[PDB]
Design a binder for this molecule. Structure first.
Ligand SMILES: [Mn+2]
Lengths: 139, 141
């Protein structure tokens, strides 16, 4: 099963992500982390997370506590062991600098969280149907 | 509200067609530009010759097994070009070799898609690309 890593400090948002993936026909495991430090410790599979499984797909919000998500994305994609893992940025940040800088950093796609839940639920369903069903994730 | 420009680099006229039909039922303002080989693809992208002032694509659908120039090489050069780098590239090819998949990812492909051997399931696939990349995704300038 595909291991999906979500780094989201918003509970309302991660709850909606869990709900969308909870009704997916594709098997998978969802690991949720709440800050940039946890995400990095995990990805670098260090102590707290030494035996931790690597993710086949990462959903990332740029605005995170402890360590900036913009930083997490850069280190993931500058690291030869993790750069191959598709990263999906899903964030509240509408800032133009962030959009460009992220794609230049090699983020796979950048998504902006709808203000209205109904649309966000639709957006997350789109992520699920595309990245978990149509896309062939790397090994 | 500028038109969405899509570059389809595909040698199979059939698969080529299916993509046109799929996009023909979209309400999204767009322009689909189809190319038949890898050399032609880099020429268009580097706006030379007949492709002078060629429109900058917002999305690129790339088949890998192409004549004249490997789609893998095209992806390689596209993602190393400071000018083309950010343009999302959606590999959409026949093979699903763990080797090609991993290679394409190491070369910075945004996502890799294997053409379904099932005509129907492929329509859906193409529908997803249109839906996700042209409506849901926040594309870069
Ligand atoms: Mn071909």
């Amino acid at each position: 099963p595909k291991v999906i890593l979500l780094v989201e400090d918003s509970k309302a948002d991660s709850r909606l992500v869990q709900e969308v993936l909870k009704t997916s026909t594709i098997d998978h495991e969802l690991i949720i982390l709440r800050d940039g430090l946890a995400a990095m410790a995990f990805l670098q599979q260090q102590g707290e997370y030494e035996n931790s499984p690597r993710p086949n797909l990462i959903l990332l919000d740029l605005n995170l506590p402890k360590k900036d998500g913009r930083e997490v994305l850069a280190e993931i994609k500058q690291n030869p062991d993790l750069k191959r893992i598709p990263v999906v940025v899903l964030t509240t940040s509408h800032n133009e600098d962030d959009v460009i800088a992220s794609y230049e950093l090699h983020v796979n796609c950048y998504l902006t969280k709808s203000r209205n839940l109904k649309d966000l639920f639709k957006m997350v369903q789109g992520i699920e149907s595309f990245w978990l069903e149509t896309v062939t994730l790397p090994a």
